[PDB]
Design an enzyme around this catalytic site. Structure first.
Site, PDB file in Angstrom:
ATOM      1  CD  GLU A 357      -3.453  -0.167   0.475  1.00 22.96           C
ATOM      2  OE1 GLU A 357      -4.467  -0.727   0.658  1.00 22.96           O
ATOM      3  OE2 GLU A 357      -3.084   1.097   0.198  1.00 22.96           O
ATOM      4  CG  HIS A 487     -13.817  -8.541 -11.394  1.00 24.26           C
ATOM      5  ND1 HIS A 487     -13.447  -7.161 -10.729  1.00 24.26           N
ATOM      6  CD2 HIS A 487     -13.282  -9.435 -10.660  1.00 24.26           C
ATOM      7  CE1 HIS A 487     -12.603  -7.426  -9.809  1.00 24.26           C
ATOM      8  NE2 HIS A 487     -12.486  -8.875  -9.681  1.00 24.26           N
TER       9      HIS A 487
END
Ligand SMILES: *[C@@H]1O[C@H](CO)[C@@H](O[C@@H]2O[C@H](CO)[C@@H](O)[C@H](O)[C@H]2NC(C)=O)[C@H](O)[C@H]1NC(C)=O
Ligand SMILES: *[C@@H]1O[C@H](CO)[C@@H](O[C@@H]2O[C@H](CO)[C@@H](O)[C@H](O)[C@H]2NC(C)=O)[C@H](O)[C@H]1NC(C)=O
Ligand SMILES: *[C@@H]1O[C@H](CO)[C@@H](O[C@@H]2O[C@H](CO)[C@@H](O)[C@H](O)[C@H]2NC(C)=O)[C@H](O)[C@H]1NC(C)=O
Ligand SMILES: *[C@@H]1O[C@H](CO)[C@@H](O[C@@H]2O[C@H](CO)[C@@H](O)[C@H](O)[C@H]2NC(C)=O)[C@H](O)[C@H]1NC(C)=O
Ligand SMILES: *[C@@H]1O[C@H](CO)[C@@H](O[C@@H]2O[C@H](CO)[C@@H](O)[C@H](O)[C@H]2NC(C)=O)[C@H](O)[C@H]1NC(C)=O
Ligand code: NAG
Lengths: 597, 98
Positions: A357, A487
C-alpha cells in the site's frame, strides 16, 4: 485568443475548481468510510452529487473547442480526457433503463441466496460460507452441489438481463464513432501521433494472443503436475488424458489455484519462511511495522512520509465499536494529504500489505505536480504493478534476516525455494489463462461474432481448449455462467489483471539489474541501492503526461510488454517440473467428459 | 489562519492583461476577456471572474498550508539623516586618561 489560449486559459480555471471540489468530496468520503453513521452517508452523497454535476457541466462546456486546432500535447490530452461524453448520448428514457438494468444486475448478484435441498429454511449467502465450502471442503458431492447451485440460481436469472445489457452498451458506444463496446475498453491503451510511440487500439489483441503463446510450455507442465497430484485426494475421478472438473480448483469460478497448496506441496515436512511468532515475541505494534516499511522505502532513495500522514491515518482499527470497513486502501485526497486506511494485525501478511500500500502512496506522492486531470498511472495497469514489486522484494529471506525477524543462522535450501516458488506460481501463472479466456470471450460476444444462441457452448468449449478445465454438468442455453463473476455483472474491465502480471516481473528485472544482483531473480532485492530508486522515480513522476510506451522504455528499455522476464523468474520451478513429469502425459484432450462414460 | 471547513477570505488574482510593474498595486474586479467577443460584464462561456480564494484548512500538507510573508525595502532618496540602527554603551569613569 490564438484559437488555443482560449483552451488553456480555460483549462486553468477548470484545474483549480476541479481540484478543490474533488477534495471536498473525497474528505467527505474518507469520513464515511472510517466512521459509519447514518448522517455521514448524507454528508457525503451531496458532496459527490455536486462534484459529479460540476464535472458533467464542464464536460458539456469543453465541447465548444475543436480538437484538431490544438498543437500542444498535454493540453490536447487533458481536453481529450475531459471532452468524453461517456454515457448520456443515448435517448433519455434509455439512459434510465440502462441505470435500472445495471443496478438490478448488481443487486441480484449481491444478495444471492442458495438453500440446501435437505433444509430449505435456513441457508447460505455467497460471501460467508460458500467460498469456505468451495475452498476447504474435500468431498466431491458437497463441492459439486456448491458449484452447480450458484450457477443454477444466479446463472439463470442473469441471462435475460445480460442480453439487453449487451445491446444497450453497444448502442451507447456506437454513438462515439466506436464500432462496439470492447473497443471502448481497449481504447485505454491508445496513443495517437507521437511519431513512433503510437499504439493502435487493435494491436492490444495481437500482443495478448502473441504473448499467451509462450506461456503454454510452462502452464502445460503445471497443469500436468496439479492433475497428477489431485489424482490422490479423489481416486478414480479424473482421467490422465482429460481436463479438470471445474469444482475442484479452489473457489467458485476457478480464478486462483492458491487453495491447492494444501494438496500439492512438494516437500510436506519442510515449513516455509514465516515470521509470525518472532514478531509478537518482540512486542511489535502497528506503528513498528509501518516504521519498518517507511525505512525500507527511504533506504532506496525515495522521500519520507509527509508528516501529515502519521497523525491523520488510521493504522489500527478503532478500539470501541466504530464500524469502518476493514479493507486496506491508499487515499490521495489531493492537496498533498495522503492517508492509509487499513485494519492492521500483527501478521507478516499485513506486514507485506503495508509495503504494497505504501507503494501506491509513493506513486501518488511522485506525480503531485502534474495538472489535475493527469493524476493517475500511465494506464490502468501500472498502479498495482509498481505497487506489487515492493511486496515481492520485501518477502525474500535476505531482507527478512536483515531486519531482525529471522535467526541469523537460518540456512535456506533448494527444497524451501521450490516450495515458495510453487506457492507463488499457483497464483501468478495460474490466473493468466482464465483471465485471457474471459476477456477474449467478452470481446467476442461484444463484437457480434458469437450469436446469442451459442453463448454457453462457446464459453465451455473455450474453457476446454484454452485453460484446461471442463464443466461437471451439462448446461443448455437458459444459463449464463460468466454473469456469475463479480467483475462481469458489475461492468468492470477485466484485462488489467493480465497486463499487470507481466509489468510486474518486467519492472522487477529492469530494476534489480541495476542493483548489481547476480543470482536467480527470485532472491533479488532492491534495498540499499540508489540507481534503482532513480530509475524508478524517473517514471513514477510522469503520471499520464507521457504515453505509457515511454514510461516502460525509460525503465526496461522496450516499447511493449514482454513475457520473457516471467519465464526467467520461474526457470528453477520449470527445471523441476520438467523432471517430475518424466512419466505422465503433458497436455489435455478435449474429448473427455465427467458424465459421458 | 486556517479554520476547519474552509476559510475563503484570502483571494489571489490569476487573470490579467499583462504582468505587473515592480511595487505596483492592482485591485480592480473587471471581468476577464480571453475570447474575441466582448463580455458586457457577464460570467460564463469564455468570460470568467478574476478572483479565486485559497481554501485553507488544517489537514493539508506542507506546501498548501497558509504561510505569512513580510518584506522590508529600504530606499535613501535625499534625506540628510533618518532612522538608523540602535546605539550601545559602557560607563563613565573619572580621573583617568581615557
Ligand atoms: C462518528 O460520527 C458520529 C456522528 O456525528 C459522531 O458522534 C457525534 O459527533 C459530534 C460531532 O462533533 C459530537 O459533537 C458528538 O458528541 C458525537 N456524539 C456521539 C454519541 O458520538 C462521532 O463523534 C464520530 N466519531 C469520531 C471518532 O469522531
Ligand atoms: C506547451 O508546449 C511548450 C512547448 O511546445 C512547453 O514548453 C516547455 O515547458 C517546459 C516546462 O513545462 C520547459 O521546461 C521547457 O523549456 C518548455 N519548452 C520551451 C521550448 O520553452 C509547455 O510546457 C507546454 N505546456 C504545458 C502545460 O506543459
Ligand atoms: C458528445 O455529444 C455531443 C452531443 O451532446 C456530440 O455532438 C456535438 O455536440 C456539440 C455540443 O453539444 C456540438 O457543438 C457539435 O456540433 C456536435 N457534433 C459533433 C461534435 O460532431 C459530440 O459529437 C459528442 N462528442 C464526440 C467526441 O463525438
Ligand atoms: C537440492 O540440492 C541437493 C544437493 O545439491 C540435491 O541432491 C542431489 O540431487 C541430485 C539430482 O539428481 C542427485 O543425483 C544426488 O544424488 C543428490 N545428492 C544426494 C547426496 O543424494 C537435490 O536433488 C536438490 N533438490 C532437488 C529437488 O533436485
Ligand atoms: C543495507 O541496509 C541496511 C539497513 O539499514 C544496513 O544495515 C546496517 O548494517 C550495519 C552493518 O552491516 C549494522 O551495524 C547496522 O546496525 C545496520 N542497520 C540496521 C538499521 O539494521 C546496511 O549497512 C546496508 N548495507 C551497506 C553496505 O551499507
Ligand atoms: C526521514 O526521517 C528521518 C527521521 O527518522 C530523518 O532522520 C531523515 O533525515 C529524513 N529524511 C528525509 C530525506 O527527509
Amino acid at each position: 485568443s490564438t484559437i488555443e489560449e482560449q483552451a488553456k486559459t480555460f483549462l486553468d480555471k477548470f484545474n483549480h475548481e476541479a481540484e478543490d471540489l474533488f477534495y471536498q468530496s473525497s474528505l467527505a468520503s474518507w469520513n464515511y468510510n472510517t466512521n459509519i453513521t447514518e448522517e455521514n452517508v448524507q454528508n457525503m452523497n451531496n458532496a459527490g452529487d455536486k462534484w459529479s454535476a460540476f464535472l458533467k457541466e464542464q464536460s458539456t462546456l469543453a465541447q465548444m473547442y475543436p480538437l484538431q486546432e490544438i498543437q500542444n500535447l498535454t493540453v490536447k490530452l487533458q481536453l481529450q480526457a475531459l471532452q468524453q461524453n461517456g454515457s448520456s448520448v443515448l435517448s433519455e428514457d434509455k439512459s434510465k433503463r440502462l441505470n435500472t438494468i445495471l443496478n438490478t444486475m448488481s443487486t441480484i448478484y449481491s444478495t444471492g441466496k442458495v438453500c440446501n435441498p435437505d433444509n430449505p429454511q435456513e441457508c447460505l449467502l455467497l460471501e460467508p460460507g460458500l467460498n469456505e465450502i468451495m475452498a476447504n471442503s474435500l468431498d466431491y458431492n458437497e463441492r459439486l452441489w456448491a458449484w452447480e447451485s450458484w450457477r443454477s440460481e444466479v446463472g439463470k436469472q442473469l441471462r435475460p438481463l445480460y442480453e439487453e445489457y449487451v445491446v444497450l452498451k453497444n448502442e451507447m458506444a456506437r454513438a462515439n464513432h466506436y464500432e462496439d463496446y470492447g473497443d471502448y475498453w481497449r481504447g485505454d491503451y491508445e496513443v495517437n501521433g507521437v511519431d513512433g510511440y503510437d499504439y493502435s487500439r487493435g494491436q492490444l489483441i495481437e500482443d495478448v494472443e502473441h504473448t499467451f503463446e509462450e506461456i503454454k510450455p510452462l502452464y502445460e507442465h503445471l497443469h500436468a503436475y496439479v492433475r497428477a497430484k489431485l489424482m490422490n485426494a479423489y481416486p478414480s475421478y479424473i482421467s490422465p488424458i482429460g481436463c479438470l472438473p471445474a469444482h475442484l480448483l479452489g473457489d467458485m469460478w476457478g480464478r486462483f489455484w492458491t487453495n491447492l497448496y494444501s494438496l500439492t506441496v512438494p516437500f510436506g515436512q519442510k515449513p516455509n519462511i514465516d515470521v509470525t511468532d518472532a514478531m509478537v515475541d518482540q512486542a511489535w505494534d502497528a506503528q513498528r511495522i509501518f516504521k519498518e516499511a517507511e525505512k525500507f522505502f527511504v533506504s532506496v532513495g525515495l522521500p519520507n512520509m509527509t508528516q501529515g500522514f502519521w497523525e491523520n491515518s488510521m493504522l489500527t482499527d478503532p478500539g470501541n465499536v466504530q464500524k469502518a470497513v476493514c479493507h486496506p486502501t491508499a487515499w490521495d485526497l489531493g492537496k498533498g494529504d495522503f492517508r492509509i486506511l487499513m485494519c492492521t494485525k500483527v501478521t507478516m501478511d499485513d506486514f507485506l500489505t503495508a509495503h504494497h500500500e505504501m507503494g501506491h502512496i509513493q506513486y501518488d506522492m511522485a506525480y503531485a505536480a502534474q495538472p489535475f486531470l493527469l493524476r493517475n498511472g500511465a494506464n490502468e495497469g501500472f498502479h498495482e504493478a509498481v505497487g506489487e514489486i515492493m511486496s515481492l522484494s520485501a518477502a525474500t529471506p535476505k531482507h527478512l534476516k536483515s531486519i531482525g525477524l529471522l535467526s541469523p543462522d537460518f540456512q535456506e535450501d533448494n527444497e524451501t525455494e521450490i516450495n515458495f516458488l510453487l506457492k507463488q506460481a499457483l497464483t501468478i501463472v495460474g490466473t493468466l489463462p482464465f483471465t485471457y479466456m474471459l476477456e477474449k470471450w467478452r470481446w467476442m460476444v461484444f463484437k457480434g461474432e458469437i450469436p446469442k444462441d451459442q453463448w454457453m457452448k462457446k464459453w465451455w468449449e473455450m474453457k476446454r481448449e484454452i485453460v484446461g478445465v471442463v464443466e461437471p454438468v451439462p448446461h443448455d442455453e437458459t444459463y449464463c455462467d460468466p454473469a456469475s463473476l463479480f467483475h462481469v455483472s458489475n461492468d468492470y474491465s477485466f484485462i488489467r489483471y493480465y497486463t499487470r502480471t507481466l509489468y510486474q516481473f518486467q519492472f522487477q528485472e529492469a530494476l534489480c539489474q541495476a542493483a548489481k544482483h547476480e543470482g536467480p531473480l527470485h532472491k533479488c532485492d532492491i534495498s540499499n541501492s540508489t540507481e534503482a530508486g532513480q530509475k524508478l522515480f524517473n517514471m513514477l513522476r510522469l503520471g499520464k503526461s507521457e504515453p505509457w510506451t515511454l514510461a516502460l522504455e525509460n525503465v526496461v528499455g522496450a516499447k511493449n510488454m514482454n513475457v520473457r522476464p516471467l519465464l526467467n523468474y520461474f526457470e528453477p520451478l520449470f527445471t523441476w517440473l520438467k523432471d517430475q513429469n518424466k512419466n505422465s502425459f503433458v497436455g489435455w484432450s478435449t474429448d473427455w467428459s465427467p458424465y459421458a462414460d | 489562519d486556517s479554520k476547519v471547513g474552509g476559510n475563503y477570505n484570502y483571494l489571489y488574482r490569476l487573470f490579467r492583461k499583462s504582468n505587473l510593474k515592480p511595487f505596483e498595486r492592482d485591485i480592480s474586479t473587471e471581468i476577464y476577456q480571453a475570447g474575441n467577443k466582448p463580455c458586457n460584464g457577464v460570467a460564463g462561456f469564455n468570460c470568467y471572474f478574476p478572483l479565486r480564494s485559497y481554501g485553507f484548512r488544517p489537514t493539508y500538507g506542507v506546501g498548501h498550508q497558509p504561510y505569512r510573508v513580510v518584506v522590508l525595502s529600504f530606499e535613501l532618496l535625499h534625506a540628510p539623516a533618518t532612522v538608523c540602527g540602535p546605539k550601545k554603551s559602557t560607563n563613565l569613569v573619572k580621573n583617568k586618561c581615557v
